[PDB]
């Protein structure tokens, strides 16, 4: 279902980037600007620099109004298409955030406050039991520290478990800053509002407290004092003794962040 | 259905007066021994830090939603525990049991509120610190006790269940007799006011009557009478009917008149006795204020 929709969007965007990028003539860049971007990346070995207008150029927004709604749905499709290209060749504010904005693209500007340290990540759990073939590598990486997989195919069972291999993996570093809202848009008698933002990967350390920036359109929500909030707090009683309950909050994630302003 | 589940009413006991006891009780908090639990007492004191009234859950309804019955859980303790999926007579002896949940409109509540009573500070020993005590209020008598008053409180003395064997006590109120009857609650007023007017030389007698315990300072009493008057008030500003007269001079005038102003008119405060939070934030009690 989503595999088919994302696969058609994926093939059309792969054809899009494989088509012309910029309409300009020989005076300047002619064509294959994103192809020259990857060759520029081959010169530097870092990432991708994408425009919203260039993605909006080929399908006249048909493909843009496909990605701008559920981007979170289309992350691995966008990575797999770029991966096949590799093997083939080698603005709003905090008030504009709703639940319909999850997965979609929206740009937010603001005021940077309280930079944070550098901490590595994981997303490569290689955890298997006491059985001889202890060389698995869980393809899970979600927002859960569940290293050992249940069903291996050794003589070991699901309860047989051991630690995750911290030596055969690919990690990344990141920081977590909390952006403040501008003081030039807050009304009178109003205190500033806060919002968390996550800076992932290569674009790390670009932050500076006290700056105006433009952000990636994507957005996430992280699983979790929000007890007795009140609100109907869900539980995980599956359909058939007695799990935890939960109450979340809106967060933010990005991959391309320019720091203009 | 149990008859306790369908009540809609309440019952109040009634204390005996001392006149018939004379023919046929003034206790202190120190006199409240922790051995009179279950007995009938009568105390007096000062209402201090009155909490707010919040609803008390009494019985819990449980909708079957499958067999259509109603399960009921009566709770008289502070806490309780959740029950099973259904306790219907038809959900039982069947493979598919129901699934219940509570209900609000079928449950029964009751008025609940508590406060603290401070000692009279006249019956306190010469080298002790006055204690206080918690009194629970329920039902009709709720929202009827202002803090910082003098009242006769009657009740029954019951402990509460919770290092292993420490019994924390309280009092359940039964009758309220308030000393110092609140005003504004005209006949008896003009019964003395019309006589006061026809008394002759009223203006000098009025200002002469406020704090007559000093000698002299007649114009000072005139200023005190005018401070006691006050009382004054489109697309502009109103007028404040407040007077602010300062006093300079020393020394035999010095607190004799200063405490007397709050006597005739009042919280007496000093310099260091009030901090920056005193004359103008605490953890909220039982009921971020």
């Amino acid at each position: 279902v989503d595999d088919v929709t994302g696969e058609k969007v994926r093939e059309a965007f792969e054809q899009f980037l494989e088509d012309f990028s910029v309409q300009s003539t020989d005076t300047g860049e002619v064509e294959k600007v994103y192809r020259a971007q990857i060759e520029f990346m081959k010169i530097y070995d870092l990432t991708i620099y994408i425009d919203y207008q260039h993605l909006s150029m080929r399908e006249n927004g048909a493909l843009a109004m496909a990605i701008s709604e559920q981007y979170y749905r289309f992350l691995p499709f966008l990575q797999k298409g770029l991966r096949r290209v590799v093997r083939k060749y080698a603005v709003h504010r905090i008030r504009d955030i709703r639940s319909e904005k999850i997965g979609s693209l929206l740009s937010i500007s603001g005021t940077v406050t309280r930079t944070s340290e550098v901490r590595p990540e994981l997303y490569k759990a290689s955890f298997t039991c006491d059985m001889c073939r202890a060389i698995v590598d869980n393809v899970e990486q979600s927002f859960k520290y569940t290293e050992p997989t249940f069903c291996p195919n050794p003589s070991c069972e699901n309860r047989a478990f051991w630690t995750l291999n911290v030596t055969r993996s690919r990690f990344l570093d990141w920081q977590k800053v909390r952006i403040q809202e501008n003081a030039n848009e807050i009304p009178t008698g109003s205190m500033p509002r806060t919002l968390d933002v996550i800076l992932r990967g290569d674009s790390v350390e670009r932050a500076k407290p006290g700056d105006r920036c433009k952000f990636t359109g994507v957005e996430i929500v992280v699983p979790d004092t929000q007890l007795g909030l009140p609100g109907v707090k869900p539980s995980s009683t599956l359909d058939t003794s007695l799990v935890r309950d939960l109450t979340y909050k809106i967060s933010f994630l990005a991959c391309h962040v320019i720091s203009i302003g | 259905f149990p008859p306790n589940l369908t009540r809609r009413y309440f019952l109040y006991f009634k204390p005996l007066s001392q006149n018939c006891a004379r023919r046929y009780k003034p206790l202190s908090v120190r006199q409240i021994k922790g051995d009179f639990l279950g007995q009938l007492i009568t105390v007096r004191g000062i209402i201090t830090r009155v909490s707010d009234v919040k609803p008390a859950v009494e019985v819990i309804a449980y909708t079957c939603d499958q067999c259509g019955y109603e399960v009921f859980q009566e709770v008289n303790s502070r806490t309780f525990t959740p029950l099973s999926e259904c306790t219907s007579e038809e959900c039982s002896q069947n493979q598919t049991k129901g699934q219940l949940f509570m209900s609000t409109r079928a449950s029964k509540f009751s008025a609940f509120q508590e406060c603290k009573i401070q000692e009279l500070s006249q019956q306190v020993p010469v080298g002790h610190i006055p204690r206080s005590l918690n009194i629970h209020v329920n039902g009709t008598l709720v929202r009827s006790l202002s803090p910082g008053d003098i009242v006769d409180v009657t009740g029954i003395f019951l402990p509460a269940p919770y290092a292993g064997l420490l019994t924390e006590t309280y009092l359940e109120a039964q009758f309220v007799r308030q000393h110092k009857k609140k005003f504004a609650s005209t006949s008896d007023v003009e019964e003395r006011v019309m006589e006061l007017i026809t008394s002759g030389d009223v203006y000098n007698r009025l200002a002469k009557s406020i704090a007559p315990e000093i000698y002299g300072n007649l114009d000072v009493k005139k200023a005190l009478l005018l401070l006691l008057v006050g009382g004054v008030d489109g697309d502009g500003m109103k007028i404040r009917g407040d007077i602010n007269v300062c006093l300079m001079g020393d020394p035999g005038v010095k607190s004799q008149l200063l405490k007397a102003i709050c006597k005739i008119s009042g919280v007496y405060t000093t310099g260091k006795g009030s901090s920056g939070v005193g004359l103008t934030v605490m953890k909220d009690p039982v009921t971020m204020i």
Binding site: - | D35, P159, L165, T167
Partner: protein, 152 residues
């Protein structure tokens, strides 16, 4: 004296002198429970002890009872159920009696029912009682065997 009070001058009746200081709070304690059964129309009886009251190492019997034998509702009663107050205070020795130059050191003595709130912080009091040591001294799960004084 509290200075030479430990190890020996132990597990006996000791006469202690000193100053009344830092009086604790007054809490009452339950001893004898009265419970009424509805259908039998009878009363019942149940007691509980702690290490302050028995003076002898007896098996502690702590939960408030209901539905004991047949299914009769053990409605508890009051008034007739007994209670006794409880209090603990500290007494350091007299400061002039101290050695060459030091901060005086102290212990505590627990009172009983008719003697609650007899010492305010700040007086001169002679005390006669019994040196009682309670608690599992670290053999529970690092220095234990905390002390107090009873029979006062």
């Amino acid at each position: 004296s509290p200075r030479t009070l430990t190890a020996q001058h132990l597990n006996k009746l000791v006469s202690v002198e000193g100053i009344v200081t830092k009086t604790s709070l007054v809490r009452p304690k339950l001893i004898r429970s009265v419970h009424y059964a509805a259908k039998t129309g009878r009363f019942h009886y149940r007691d509980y002890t702690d290490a302050t009251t028995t003076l002898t190492t007896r098996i502690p019997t702590p939960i408030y009872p209901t539905e004991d034998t047949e299914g009769n509702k053990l409605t508890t009663e009051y008034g007739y159920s007994t209670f006794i107050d409880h209090q603990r205070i500290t007494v350091q020795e007299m400061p002039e009696m101290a050695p060459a130059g030091q901060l005086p050191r102290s212990i505590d003595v627990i009172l009983d029912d008719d003697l609650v709130d007899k010492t305010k912080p700040g007086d001169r009091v002679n005390v006669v009682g019994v040196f009682k040591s309670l608690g599992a001294g670290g053999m529970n799960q690092l220095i234990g065997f905390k002390t107090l004084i009873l029979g006062n």
